[PDB]
Design a protein around this nucleic acid. Structure first.
Ligand code: MG
Ligand code: MG
Lengths: 1107, 57
DNA sequence: TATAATGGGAGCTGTCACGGATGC
DNA sequence: GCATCCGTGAGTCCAGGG
């Protein structure tokens, strides 16, 4: 159908590759495509260069590394719970210094996980994303002392875990202290160790008045560098022998050892720019020709004194400016764990260099392998990939965390780090962030933003030269952005000339009205201010930010539907999102389609080559939503490069399809849409709208026991033929069977634990004369509330290219699919932050309906709009009404979209279609329509004196219609807003959440019910629930909660028995967790005694613990 | 007052610091067992070192 | 069971109010 | 005694866990 698009801003550049922050970062770290001799000293190469050589004699040196091919492809890794990875080899050579002997070998170091095409990892079968971290950049900072108003703290900050934080301060007594590892000593001492004389310090610092006097200490200048160095080593290491070579080694490792101190390239560049100096390397001092040489300390002190005095060109630093906060991407995070593993490996090497009589013999790879594994599994930036829908994955790869190793601790993060700083503009989305306690600490990269080689976020601007806007675009950091006057992207242009006398611009974030002459740059697009998710909200300019945040976040949670549709009002970013997230197959070059299947597409390209594309069909995502690709071409069709070959999940002809377009009425409805509840039509179920496919995975193991082996079998003791009906010969449920709660998926038997039968059992056996069998039923059954159709079984048994962990003989996995129809308690939402649970599904004859008999689909309450202030959803609905009757869709770009007049034109055309149809078919205006027009006239909505048709048209241009109540045939007494709205079904389905328990498993130590639906758990009756019962005086209810219902063992047994006998519950006794508390206090050497009123002990342990 | 110094250290009953085989036969145990084992090894080595009259250091 | 071997490594960073403990 | 310099324990609810 026809797509009409609005707006006058033409985007000079498209969005960059939206996952490049992942892909390019990791490619940089591995340098796998680069011939070894051409590699830069970065990434894992730089890790190797820091570790090696390994000395002390023997020497083990690094030549080069190599990455081989992955032993298993990606799908096989998902299927067999493998890690997708490449073997790492290193060429090393051992030289004995005195012999001259040289032994060389390529040693195998383990495996390194590989990034897949879309930017994610496959760690032990599960997809994972390494989330980028934001931190304070290394460098040299100057900050107000929060105590002393006219004094300043200087802070030297290296890369994380690459040196200590050093602070310089001007003490109230006037001496300039240095703090490192929490040790306040006079800086003069270190200056002396560096080789500075009072002459050089006088001539270099005296300009700043009396400050330099607090630096002059004669007892220090009276000592040569060696005596000062030993003095520092004493006041830094109390009790350590002040050995000369040990003091040199310590201070060198603290200030000058590049293998231990590292400002990084960013900290280097910023320290140089700030202090106006040049650095040889990346450390604070060097060791040259037997002595220490200063690099940073004197320039830092120079600046600190100049700032304290007041001399111009010296300012304090804004630590939240995005020129001072940088992004650690996956490549850097991984390289750091690699560097730690390599350091442990080198310690093992030196260890074996002492004890021994080859490179391989010297190298134990295990620590390295351990560190990488530890990074990729148990890190806080290593996250289970969200692939609910394909936008979810794309968005996940662009997230930014201020938490993680080397970052902030929540519950402590103040208001400053969580703020949106002025410099976030075009760099970090200002709306998309969590609503809980993590608010402001997790964020999203802006659509046009790019992380530069140093890790600062850059945004693009177009160059303006004398009022002419060029096509030169320049990516800037926030420091560079601050130099210029930058115009807003909606500045009116005639061709390339700014066609306005007054121009809205920014100077250092500050809004300012400016002449064209003064304009230096101009924004590329409103799009650059917001995340990808926020860029998908039409009419964003009419939505309060708080609800825009919710619409942003909830697009992530949309379930892919079997009949998904793209929105009738789009922003124009839907195709690019489908493309960048690999949610579709596209033609590689021009060609012709040779074969088309549910399973595969074969295309003949211009080269004559015949390329085959297998289609992924009903695959299970990390979240159980269905990944399947559907072909969208036919045999013989001519395709150009980039044309769509197949739709993935949430894709409709290559457009992002996160839900359905439904016909909506905005009106109250009998309490059923009270407080954000939502009423829907049964029609939606009838035509499988909001139907989704979900796939669950169940797993069972058969292991060797000391009591005999577990067996996966059909021969299960005491089960009928009905219970085994759908079990295969080997005891595994067959493909296509319908399984319900209780049904067996995998039969399994286990040998019984050695037990003498209770005398009652002995007698019951004699009465029936039946030998108790030797194995018991331990089968895998469908848990409560689950089930569906069996669609796959995998069977890995030992003795078969298959080897499992020690003692397991076989693993069986069963895949079960369900088609989930929308039901009461499921969550729906729109892109403007309107969200609600379905409270009522009405039959079609109860639905409000148009005069032509068309019922609406969903009924949203008007009380949800005024206090939420998200009017974009109203405009969307108005335009949806137009589109409904014109058979068209719209692209309305954010801040550059459809305006009310154009929507009114379209509603006039749509009215002609909606009403002239009637006037032709031989009908006039209804009596009920006349009653509603009478009311509308009193409401001020229609002009008195016009004809029925003209007034109906006025209403229609306000987006309102006469609506009939399906229960009565009488009209709603005012005209109602009706139109098409895009609504998604979110991944919060009551099918997954409903859970109840009578009794069930209890905890080992506390004897309290376990938690969790999978453990058949109980609900927590926490401290505050207890307070509520206390405040009602509900003493017995509360005593039940604390005893008979939790960890009163005899109480719970006796209450179950009394109920099944129809008696009343007995009186509770002591909870077990109080017994546990008494025993744990006895272990602390405390005697805790329950007494009676006569102060005589009472034994709560019933003699069982007294000798 | 002297009861604030320990001579006999109490040992918690073993079901409050269990050693349990989970599904799969693999074993899980409380940290307290390792803290006790450290204490017991150090005490036993002290009793032996006293028996051999080891130097004061 | 015997050549001789004699003092270790790791740090690590954006909170806050409050009770008690050290310097003036 | 009078301030300063320290340690220390604390931060809503649920869910699942990869
Ligand atoms: Mg949240
Ligand atoms: Mg959370």
């Amino acid at each position: 159908m026809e797509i009409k698009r609005f707006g006058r801003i033409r985007e000079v550049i498209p969005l960059p590759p939206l996952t490049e922050i992942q892909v390019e970062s990791y490619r940089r770290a591995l340098q796998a495509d680069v011939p070894p001799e051409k590699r830069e000293n970065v990434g894992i190469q730089a890790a190797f260069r820091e570790t090696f050589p390994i000395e002390e004699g023997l020497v083990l040196d690094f030549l080069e590394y190599r990455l081989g091919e992955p032993p298993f492809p990606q799908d096989e890794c998902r299927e067999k719970d493998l890690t997708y990875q490449a073997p790492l080899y290193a060429r090393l050579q051992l030289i004995h210094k005195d012999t001259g002997l040289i032994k060389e070998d390529e040693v195998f170091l383990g495996h390194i996980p590989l990034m897949t095409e879309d930017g994610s990892f496959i760690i032990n079968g599960a997809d994972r994303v390494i989330v980028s971290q934001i931190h304070r950049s290394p460098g040299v900072y100057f900050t107000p002392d929060p105590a002393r108003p006219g004094r300043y703290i200087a802070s030297i900050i290296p890369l994380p875990k690459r040196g200590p934080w050093i602070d310089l301060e001007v003490e109230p007594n006037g001496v300039v202290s240095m703090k490192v590892n929490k040790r306040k000593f006079p800086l003069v001492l270190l200056l002396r160790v560096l080789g500075y004389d009072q002459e050089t310090l006088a001539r270099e610092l005296g300009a700043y008045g009396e400050l330099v006097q607090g630096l002059m200490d004669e007892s220090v200048f009276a000592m040569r560098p060696e005596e000062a160095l030993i003095r520092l080593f004493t006041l830094l290491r109390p009790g350590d022998p002040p050995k000369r070579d040990k003091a040199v080694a310590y201070v060198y490792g603290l200030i000058a050892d590049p293998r231990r101190y590292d400002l990084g390239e960013a900290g280097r560049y910023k320290a140089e720019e700030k202090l106006g100096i040049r650095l040889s390397g990346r450390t604070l001092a060097r060791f040259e020709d037997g002595e220490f040489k200063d690099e940073v300390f004197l320039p830092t002190l120079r600046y600190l004194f100049a700032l304290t005095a007041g001399v111009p060109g010296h300012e304090v630093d804004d630590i939240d400016h995005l020129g001072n906060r940088r992004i650690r991407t996956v490549g850097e995070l991984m390289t750091d764990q690699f560097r730690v593993g390599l350091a442990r490996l080198a310690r093992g090497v030196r260890e074996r260099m002492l004890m021994g009589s080859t490179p391989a013999k010297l190298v134990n790879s295990r620590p390295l392998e351990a560190a990488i594994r530890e990074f990729f599994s148990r890190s806080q930036l290593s996250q289970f990939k969200d692939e609910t829908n394909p936008l979810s994955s794309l968005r996940h790869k662009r997230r930014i965390s201020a938490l993680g190793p080397g970052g902030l601790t929540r519950e402590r993060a103040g208001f400053d780090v969580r703020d949106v700083h002025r410099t976030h503009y075009g760099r970090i989305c200002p709306v998309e962030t969590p609503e809980g306690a993590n608010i402001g600490l997790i964020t999203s990269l802006a659509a046009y933003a790019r992380v530069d080689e140093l890790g600062f976020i850059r945004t693009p601007y177009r160059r303006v030269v004398g009022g002419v806007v060029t096509d030169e675009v320049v990516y800037m950091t926030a420091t560079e952005e601050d130099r210029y006057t930058i115009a807003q992207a909606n500045t009116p242009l005639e061709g390339n000339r700014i066609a306005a006398e007054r121009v809205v611009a920014r100077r250092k974030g500050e809004p300012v009205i400016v002449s064209p002459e003064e304009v230096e740059f101009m924004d590329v697009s409103p799009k650059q201010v917001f995340s990808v998710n926020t860029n998908l909200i039409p009419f964003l300019e009419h939505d309060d930010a708080n609800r825009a945040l919710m619409g942003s976040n909830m697009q992530t949670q949309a379930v892919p539907l079997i009949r998904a549709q793209a929105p009738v009002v789009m922003t124009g970013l839907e195709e690019r999102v489908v493309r960048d997230s690999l949610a579709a197959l596209y033609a590689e070059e021009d060609g012709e389609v040779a074969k088309v299947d549910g399973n595969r597409i074969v295309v003949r390209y211009e080269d004559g080559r015949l390329v085959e594309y297998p289609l992924r069909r009903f695959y299970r995502s990390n979240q159980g939503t269905a990944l399947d690709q559907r072909p969208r071409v036919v045999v013989g069709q001519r395709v150009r490069k980039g044309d769509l070959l197949a739709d993935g999940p949430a894709s409709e002809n290559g457009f992002l399809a996160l839900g359905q377009n439904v016909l909506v009425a905005i009106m109250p409805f009998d309490g059923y849409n009270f407080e954000d509840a939502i009423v829907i039509s049964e029609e939606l179920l009838k035509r499988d709208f909001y139907t989704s496919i979900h796939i669950e995975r169940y797993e069972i193991e058969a292991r060797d026991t000391k009591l005999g082996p577990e067996r996966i079998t059909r021969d299960i003791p005491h089960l009928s033929e009905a219970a085994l009906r759908d079990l295969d010969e080997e005891g595994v449920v067959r493909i296509g069977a319908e399984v319900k709660p209780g049904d067996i998926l995998v039969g399994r038997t286990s040998f019984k634990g050695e037990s003498e039968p209770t005398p009652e059992e002995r007698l019951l056996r004699s009465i029936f004369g039946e030998k108790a069998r030797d194995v018991k039923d331990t089968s895998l059954r469908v848990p409560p509330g689950e089930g569906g159709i069996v669609v796959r079984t995998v069977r890995l048994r030992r003795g078969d290219g298959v080897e499992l962990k020690p003692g397991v003989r076989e693993v069986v996995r069963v895949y079960v699919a369900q088609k989930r129809k929308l039901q009461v308690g499921d969550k729906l939402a729109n892109r403007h932050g309107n969200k609600g649970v379905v409270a009522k599904i009405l039959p079609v004859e109860d639905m409000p309906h148009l005069p032509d008999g068309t019922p609406v689909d969903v009924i949203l309450n008007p009380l949800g709009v005024p206090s939420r202030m998200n009017l974009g959803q109203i405009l969307e609905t108005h335009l949806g009404l137009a589109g409904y009757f014109l058979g068209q869709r719209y692209i309305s770009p954010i801040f550059d979209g459809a305006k009310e007049p154009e929507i009114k034109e379209l509603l006039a055309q749509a009215f002609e279609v909606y009403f002239g149809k009637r006037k032709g078919e031989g009908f006039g205006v209804d009596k009920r329509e006349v009653e509603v027009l009478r009311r509308a006239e009193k409401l001020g909505l229609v002009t008195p004196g016009k004809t029925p048709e003209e007034q109906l048209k006025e209403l229609f241009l306000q987006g309102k219609v006469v609506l009939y109540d399906g229960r009565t045939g009488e009209p709603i007494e005012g005209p109602i807003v009706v139109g098409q709205m895009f609504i998604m079904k979110l991944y919060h389905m009551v099918e997954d959440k409903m859970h109840a328990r009578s009794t069930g498993p209890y905890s080992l130590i506390t004897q309290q019910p376990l938690g969790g639906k999978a453990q058949f758990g109980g609900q927590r009756f926490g401290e505050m629930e207890v307070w509520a019962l206390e405040a009602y005086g509900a003493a017995h209810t509360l005593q039940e909660m604390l005893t008979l219902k939790s960890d009163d063992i005899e109480g719970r047994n006796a209450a179950y028995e009394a109920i099944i006998k129809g008696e009343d519950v007995p009186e509770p006794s002591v909870p077990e967790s109080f017994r546990v508390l008494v025993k744990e206090l006895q272990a602390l050497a405390l005697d805790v005694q329950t007494l009676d009123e006569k102060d005589n002990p009472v034994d709560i342990f019933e003699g069982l613990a007294s000798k | 007052p002297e009861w604030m110094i320990l001579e006999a250290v109490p040992v918690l009953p073993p079901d409050l610091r269990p050693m349990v085989q989970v599904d799969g036969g693999r074993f899980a145990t409380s940290d307290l067992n390792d803290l006790y084992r450290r204490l017991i090894n150090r005490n036993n080595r002290l009793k032996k070192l006293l028996a051999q009259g080891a130097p004061e250091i």
